[PDB]
Scaffold this active site. Structure first.
Site, PDB file in Angstrom:
ATOM      1  N   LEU A  14       2.284 -12.062  -4.485  1.00 51.82           N
ATOM      2  CA  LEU A  14       3.390 -11.260  -3.864  1.00 51.82           C
ATOM      3  C   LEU A  14       2.868 -10.309  -2.827  1.00 51.82           C
ATOM      4  O   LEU A  14       3.436 -10.155  -1.754  1.00 51.82           O
ATOM      5  CB  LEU A  14       4.167 -10.417  -4.927  1.00 51.82           C
ATOM      6  CG  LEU A  14       4.912 -11.299  -5.933  1.00 51.82           C
ATOM      7  CD1 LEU A  14       5.348 -10.428  -7.136  1.00 51.82           C
ATOM      8  CD2 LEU A  14       6.173 -11.925  -5.391  1.00 51.82           C
ATOM      9  N   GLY A  15       1.817  -9.589  -3.150  1.00 51.93           N
ATOM     10  CA  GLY A  15       1.300  -8.739  -2.089  1.00 51.93           C
ATOM     11  C   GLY A  15      -0.018  -8.171  -2.495  1.00 51.93           C
ATOM     12  O   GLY A  15      -0.576  -8.569  -3.533  1.00 51.93           O
ATOM     13  N   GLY A  17      -3.112  -4.765  -1.358  1.00 49.75           N
ATOM     14  CA  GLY A  17      -3.199  -3.468  -0.704  1.00 49.75           C
ATOM     15  C   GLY A  17      -3.959  -2.526  -1.619  1.00 49.75           C
ATOM     16  O   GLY A  17      -3.923  -2.675  -2.848  1.00 49.75           O
ATOM     17  N   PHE A  19      -6.999  -2.459  -2.590  1.00 49.88           N
ATOM     18  CA  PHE A  19      -7.934  -3.090  -3.564  1.00 49.88           C
ATOM     19  C   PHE A  19      -7.290  -3.821  -4.766  1.00 49.88           C
ATOM     20  O   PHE A  19      -8.015  -4.357  -5.631  1.00 49.88           O
ATOM     21  CB  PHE A  19      -8.952  -2.071  -4.092  1.00 49.88           C
ATOM     22  CG  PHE A  19      -9.917  -1.584  -3.041  1.00 49.88           C
ATOM     23  CD1 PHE A  19      -9.885  -0.248  -2.601  1.00 49.88           C
ATOM     24  CD2 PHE A  19     -10.841  -2.457  -2.467  1.00 49.88           C
ATOM     25  CE1 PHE A  19     -10.773   0.196  -1.600  1.00 49.88           C
ATOM     26  CE2 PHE A  19     -11.733  -2.008  -1.499  1.00 49.88           C
ATOM     27  CZ  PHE A  19     -11.695  -0.686  -1.070  1.00 49.88           C
ATOM     28  N   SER A  21      -4.100  -6.639  -6.158  1.00 52.06           N
ATOM     29  CA  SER A  21      -3.115  -7.653  -5.749  1.00 52.06           C
ATOM     30  C   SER A  21      -2.039  -7.749  -6.833  1.00 52.06           C
ATOM     31  O   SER A  21      -2.318  -7.468  -8.030  1.00 52.06           O
ATOM     32  CB  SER A  21      -3.800  -8.991  -5.570  1.00 52.06           C
ATOM     33  OG  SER A  21      -4.078  -9.530  -6.843  1.00 52.06           O
ATOM     34  N   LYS A  41      -0.079  -6.872 -11.683  1.00 58.24           N
ATOM     35  CA  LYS A  41      -1.090  -6.260 -10.834  1.00 58.24           C
ATOM     36  C   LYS A  41      -2.429  -6.285 -11.515  1.00 58.24           C
ATOM     37  O   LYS A  41      -2.618  -5.992 -12.731  1.00 58.24           O
ATOM     38  CB  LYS A  41      -0.737  -4.852 -10.445  1.00 58.24           C
ATOM     39  CG  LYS A  41      -1.760  -4.159  -9.492  1.00 58.24           C
ATOM     40  CD  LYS A  41      -1.193  -2.886  -8.848  1.00 58.24           C
ATOM     41  CE  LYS A  41      -2.214  -2.245  -7.899  1.00 58.24           C
ATOM     42  NZ  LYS A  41      -1.648  -1.010  -7.289  1.00 58.24           N
ATOM     43  N   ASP A 129       2.169   7.199  -0.907  1.00 58.00           N
ATOM     44  CA  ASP A 129       2.272   5.979  -0.029  1.00 58.00           C
ATOM     45  C   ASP A 129       3.747   5.561   0.146  1.00 58.00           C
ATOM     46  O   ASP A 129       4.123   4.352   0.101  1.00 58.00           O
ATOM     47  CB  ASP A 129       1.416   4.878  -0.662  1.00 58.00           C
ATOM     48  CG  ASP A 129       1.080   3.703   0.302  1.00 58.00           C
ATOM     49  OD1 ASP A 129       1.011   3.934   1.533  1.00 58.00           O
ATOM     50  OD2 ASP A 129       0.796   2.579  -0.222  1.00 58.00           O
TER      51      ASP A 129
HETATM   52  C1  LIG Z   1       3.257  -6.038  -3.533  1.00 51.88           C
HETATM   53  C2  LIG Z   1       3.657  -4.779  -4.384  1.00 51.88           C
HETATM   54  N1  LIG Z   1       4.678  -5.218  -5.359  1.00 51.88           N
HETATM   55  C3  LIG Z   1       4.829  -4.780  -6.632  1.00 51.88           C
HETATM   56  O1  LIG Z   1       4.063  -3.970  -7.100  1.00 51.88           O
HETATM   57  C4  LIG Z   1       5.911  -5.357  -7.383  1.00 51.88           C
HETATM   58  C5  LIG Z   1       6.287  -5.096  -8.713  1.00 51.88           C
HETATM   59  N2  LIG Z   1       7.383  -5.848  -8.973  1.00 51.88           N
HETATM   60  C6  LIG Z   1       7.749  -6.596  -7.891  1.00 51.88           C
HETATM   61  N3  LIG Z   1       8.755  -7.468  -7.734  1.00 51.88           N
HETATM   62  C7  LIG Z   1       8.890  -8.091  -6.573  1.00 51.88           C
HETATM   63  C8  LIG Z   1       8.016  -7.817  -5.501  1.00 51.88           C
HETATM   64  O2  LIG Z   1       8.227  -8.567  -4.377  1.00 51.88           O
HETATM   65  C9  LIG Z   1       7.455  -8.277  -3.250  1.00 51.88           C
HETATM   66  C10 LIG Z   1       7.031  -9.373  -2.430  1.00 51.88           C
HETATM   67  C11 LIG Z   1       6.323  -9.137  -1.240  1.00 51.88           C
HETATM   68  C12 LIG Z   1       6.069  -7.836  -0.796  1.00 51.88           C
HETATM   69  C13 LIG Z   1       6.532  -6.767  -1.560  1.00 51.88           C
HETATM   70  C14 LIG Z   1       7.242  -6.987  -2.774  1.00 51.88           C
HETATM   71  N4  LIG Z   1       6.982  -7.001  -5.638  1.00 51.88           N
HETATM   72  C15 LIG Z   1       6.827  -6.345  -6.841  1.00 51.88           C
HETATM   73  C16 LIG Z   1       4.092  -3.596  -3.501  1.00 51.88           C
HETATM   74  C17 LIG Z   1       5.516  -3.596  -2.966  1.00 51.88           C
HETATM   75  C18 LIG Z   1       5.097  -2.537  -3.975  1.00 51.88           C
END
Ligand SMILES: C[C@H](NC(=O)c1c[nH]c2ncc(Oc3ccccc3)nc12)C1CC1
Ligand SMILES: NC(=O)Nc1ccccc1
Length: 277
Positions: A14-15, A17, A19, A21, A41, A129
């Site tokens: 999903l993402g 940042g 350090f 994922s 995470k 952030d």
């Molecule tokens: C990547 C991190 N994401 C999380 O910690 C997330 C925790 N639950 C989620 N559900 C959907 C989602 O969907 C996404 C998909 C791509 C980008 C961001 C959130 N991200 C997250 C950051 C945004 C806080």
């Protein structure tokens, strides 16, 4: 609350940042693909300072209980298990759905983020952030603050926190005192919320993004940005921005952290605008 690693099935990334994922996984203890989806995470790779930071992030998130904060579900032993919100982040959602989302709705999201920040503040948590890319969308009419990878708890006797290493996030969301002295506080989160109100009201359009506006306003960029801010320069009102929304952004961007309103003062104001839109 304790998830077994063997039951967490990897689906996609999903993402990423600071350090870490986040992966989309299915928690599938029957092994038949019927389990619920979760966001998990973990560190991208091992490292002892990252590890200690990660343990604190988990302890912080576990103790936060708010409709406007992403829900901690548990741990796997090394991984943080959270609710998965398939609509993804607010930055993306705004760009995809702008034609459908009017000023009222943006004010609704603004009020919800403010209320989540008010709760964080009451817990002595500085988020550090805040940005649309770190706010998640639960449904059309509900957003939740995420990304606690940089969050700090303020000691009982001090209302700010000095970080030692330079920041690694896009510079245009940081308060001047953070840019110049690495000071972070609840009032630096208010500065960043003003930038989030700007994102909301531009619908995260890349051509009028905080970054694009700087290269137009025109020596290292960080020093240039600070000089522009000290001179009193600010991001221009977004196209079609209601006047009162723009006045709120400017208040969030007061030079002196003590002259910015608190999230408790902002909240009622957004609600009144939401009720008057
Ligand atoms: C990547 C991190 N994401 C999380 O910690 C997330 C925790 N639950 C989620 N559900 C959907 C989602 O969907 C996404 C998909 C791509 C980008 C961001 C959130 N991200 C997250 C950051 C945004 C806080
Ligand atoms: N808060 C604010 O107005 N920041 C800013 C100003 C110029 C360029 C990029 C960001």
């Amino acid at each position: 609350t304790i998830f077994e690693e063997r039951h967490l099935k990897y689906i996609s990334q999903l993402g990423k940042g600071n350090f870490g994922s986040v992966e989309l996984c299915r928690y599938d203890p029957l092994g038949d693909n019927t389990g619920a989806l979760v966001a998990v995470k973990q560190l991208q790779h091992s490292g002892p300072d990252q590890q200690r930071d990660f343990q604190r992030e988990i302890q912080i998130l576990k103790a936060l209980h708010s409709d406007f904060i992403v829900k901690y579900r548990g741990v796997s032993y090394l991984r943080l298990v959270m609710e998965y919100l398939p609509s993804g982040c607010l930055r993306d959602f705004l760009q995809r759905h702008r034609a459908r989302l009017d000023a009222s709705r943006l004010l609704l999201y603004s009020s919800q983020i403010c209320k989540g920040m008010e709760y964080l503040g009451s817990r002595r948590c500085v988020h550090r952030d805040l940005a649309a890319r770190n706010i998640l969308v639960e449904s059309e009419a509900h957003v939740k603050i995420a990304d606690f990878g940089l969050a700090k708890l303020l000691p009982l006797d001090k209302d700010y926190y000095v970080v030692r290493e330079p920041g690694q996030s896009p510079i245009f969301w940081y308060a001047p005192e953070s840019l110049s002295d690495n000071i972070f506080s609840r009032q630096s989160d208010v500065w960043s919320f003003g930038v989030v109100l700007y994102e909301l009201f531009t619908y995260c359009d890349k051509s009028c993004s905080p970054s694009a506006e700087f290269l137009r306003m025109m020596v290292p960029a960080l020093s240039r940005l600070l000089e522009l801010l000290e001179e009193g320069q600010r991001l221009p009102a977004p196209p079609a921005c209601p006047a009162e929304v723009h006045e709120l952004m400017k208040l969030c961007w007061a030079p002196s952290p003590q002259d910015r309103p608190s999230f408790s003062a902002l909240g009622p104001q957004l609600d009144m605008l939401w009720s008057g839109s």
